[PDB]
Design a protein around this nucleic acid. Structure first.
Lengths: 170, 296, 51, 127
RNA sequence: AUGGUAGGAUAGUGGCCUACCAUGGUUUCAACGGGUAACGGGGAAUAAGGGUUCGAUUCCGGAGAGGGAGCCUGAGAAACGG
């Protein structure tokens, strides 16, 4: 029953709520479909006759890229640690767009050994991500909006993307 | 005719440049006008205000009196100098004697009535002359004589017809939109020496025409910022409207409901209506439980 | 710091604010009423031979 | 500096800064194409596209951040009064961080997938 | 309420909504406010081969199916065909 209609607002002057229509089918402000982590669940929603939106209610893995060589595998999720526009969204652990979520990127390491053949100090990458392949808790954002895609996509953070975000972590 | 037309154009702009410079006096005077309205109003409230900071208030009141009397003498002096140079005052000998005389407050009072009366006779001559000048030039005298007499009054006549009603326009200037309360205003009304605050007679906020004047400022300053820059287009004018009303006296959290609202929500009065003594103990042994805690 | 003290200095800061600007304004008006025209308007003397 | 919020911003661009040609006879200033501000809502090096309606007018207010108010006006001809009368309707437009815009400053504005409910136009050229 | 960015939602721009910021925007060229059986306006439409300017043509101002509340399918719709 949420409204997305434009006539509900006040004018640039601030006109006093002229009350022309009530709600119709066309301005159907849908519910906020906040997700969480867990076993994958899909809702199919029919809008505009033939457009099938995909509501992601629970999701467990994602396709996250690493831009320095341009590759992306399937990684199991761990948990969100920061979101820019909200803070209780993190405590809820609901994955929206641009949320900074932990993963255990073991097949990223397995690809790294299958492409280079050298252990990670237990052609090169900068030192601040060597702090947590030993921890095995790699940070990644969310690229796609999961509420209509029915998919979880992101990229691993790269260079200054850490150096601005652990600054915002602490 | 080219040199005679546009020599007046130098006279227009120099009068318009001098027009803008006097509004700079009108800009810089408002902090005195605002703080004067928060002064104590009665004779007795001045004395109680002089008790708290008695030595500090006495030098500043003498400093206020010296700076006001200095500013009052020179402004009469400039008004005498302006009316002589713009041939408003026909008596140069009387006006030149007033410039060299050290005047008290009452003599500056009486000379104000002298310069305003000479301006009044100059005004009714000018306003009747120029309203006749535009009506003959526009050609509407031969087309609008018999139908719209109530609207086509002369500009001098349109002035004095609004000067029939001093009463309503004096109800305008008591409108306290600023919510300014003078010192010991609450004590003086309670003592009978003097509540809808929206009309307050002892409060003198002439902001209504001054906001019109500041609207007249931004209309004339835009037209006079053509070449490089004028005196003050919007600096300390719209801000002067703001800080007297505390820029907007609004809170963003109270807007969104992100701040708590201490107002009655009119549907939710009495559905979950209260009960009897719902404490199954007699509440004084729980006071012992609250004094001597079973965790403390 | 009493409230009356803050009001009197607020008037005092505004009184000298109008005190210096009318010196500039009467300085402009004296230069526009006497024939000692400054260098910014020397062209008015050159344009009009009947000054 | 440019980084002043809780999230890094960069346009996906459908050279590290893709130049986009406006059309309608326009060209970027060199400050815009070699800048450092990101500003995806700016009509150049951003996802928004400039097209359609154009108008020119005078900036009347520039008091606050990244949008400005343009006074455009005309001596409007009332037919019954037989009078050209000046009428201004100050519309708010977006300003990009490529043009140090003050009041006055005749400019050109055009529609940019209108941003927030009154910002319908966007600056493209100063003079 | 005005913008900034982010997120949600939308078929989609969007303060539409939310988060956190900056405080602003419209005006004497009239912002806001009092009058209208606005069965009155609209070239909406041929005309009336002289009924003074129209006899006539139509768009027209909305809500609803006993009443609030929510849901449902269809390129159509918050249906009087649930």
């Amino acid at each position: 029953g949420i409204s997305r209609d434009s006539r509900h607002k006040r004018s640039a002057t601030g006109a006093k709520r002229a009350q022309f229509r009530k709600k119709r089918k066309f301005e159907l402000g849908r519910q906020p479909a906040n997700t969480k982590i867990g076993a994958k669940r899909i809702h199919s929603v029919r809008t505009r006759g033939g457009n099938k939106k995909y509501r992601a209610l629970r999701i467990e893995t994602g396709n996250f890229s690493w831009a320095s060589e341009g590759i992306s595998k399937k990684t199991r999720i761990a948990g969100v640690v920061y979101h820019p526009s909200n803070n209780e969204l993190v405590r809820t652990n609901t994955l929206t767009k641009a949320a900074i979520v932990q993963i255990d990127a073991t097949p990223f390491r397995q690809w790294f050994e299958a492409h280079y053949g050298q252990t990670l100090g237990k052609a090169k990458i900068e030192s601040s991500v060597e702090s947590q392949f030993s921890a095995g808790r790699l940070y990644a954002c969310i690229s796609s909006r999961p509420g209509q895609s029915g998919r979880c996509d992101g990229y691993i953070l790269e260079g200054e993307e850490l150096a601005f975000y652990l600054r915002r972590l602490t | 005719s080219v040199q005679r037309d546009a020599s007046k154009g130098y006279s227009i702009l120099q009068q318009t440049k001098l027009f803008d410079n006097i509004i700079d006096l009108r800009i810089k005077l408002q902090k005195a006008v605002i703080a004067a309205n928060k002064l104590p109003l009665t004779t007795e409230s001045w004395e109680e205000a002089k008790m708290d900071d008695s030595e500090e208030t006495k030098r500043l009141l003498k400093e206020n009196e010296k700076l006001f009397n200095n500013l009052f003498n020179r402004l009469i002096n400039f008004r005498i100098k302006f009316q002589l140079g713009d041939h408003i005052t026909q008596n140069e000998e009387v006006a030149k004697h007033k410039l060299s005389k050290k005047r008290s407050l009452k003599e500056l009072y009486q000379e104000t009535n002298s310069l305003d009366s000479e301006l009044k006779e100059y005004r009714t001559a000018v306003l009747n002359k120029w309203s006749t000048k535009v009506s003959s030039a526009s050609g509407n005298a031969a087309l609008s004589s018999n139908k719209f007499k109530a609207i086509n009054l002369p500009a001098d006549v349109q002035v004095e017809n609004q000067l029939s009603d001093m009463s309503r326009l004096m109800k305008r200037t008591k409108l306290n939109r600023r919510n300014i309360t003078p010192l010991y205003f609450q004590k003086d009304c309670a003592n009978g020496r003097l509540i809808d605050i929206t009309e307050n007679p002892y409060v003198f906020d002439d902001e209504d025409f001054y906001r019109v004047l500041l609207n007249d400022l931004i209309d004339k300053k835009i037209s006079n910022a053509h070449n490089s820059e004028s005196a003050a287009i919007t600096i300390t004018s719209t801000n002067a409207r703001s800080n007297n009303k505390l820029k907007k006296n609004i809170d963003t959290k109270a807007s969104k409901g992100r701040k708590l609202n201490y107002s009655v929500q009119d549907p939710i009065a009495n559905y979950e209506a209260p009960i009897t003594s719902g404490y199954k103990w007699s509440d004084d042994q729980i006071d012992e439980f609250f004094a001597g805690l079973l965790g403390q | 710091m009493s409230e009356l003290n803050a009001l009197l200095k607020d008037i005092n800061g505004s009184l000298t604010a109008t005190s210096e600007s009318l010196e500039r304004l009467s300085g402009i008006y004296s230069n526009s009423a006497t024939d000692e025209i400054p260098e910014s308007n020397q062209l008015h003397e050159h344009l009009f031979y009947d000054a | 500096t440019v980084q002043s919020e809780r999230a890094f911003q960069k346009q996906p661009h459908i050279t590290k800064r893709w130049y986009k040609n406006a059309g309608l006879g326009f060209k970027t200033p060199k400050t815009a194409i070699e800048g450092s501000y990101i500003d995806k809502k700016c009509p150049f090096t951003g996802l928004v596209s400039i097209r359609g309606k154009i108008l020119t007018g005078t900036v009347v207010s520039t008091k606050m951040h990244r949008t400005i108010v343009i006074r455009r006006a005309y001596l409007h001809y009332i037919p019954k009064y037989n009078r050209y009368e000046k009428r201004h309707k100050n519309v708010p437009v977006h300003v990009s961080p490529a043009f140090r815009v003050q009041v006055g400053d005749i400019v050109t504005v055009g529609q940019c997938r209108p941003i927030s409910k009154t910002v319908r136009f966007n600056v493209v050229k100063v003079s």
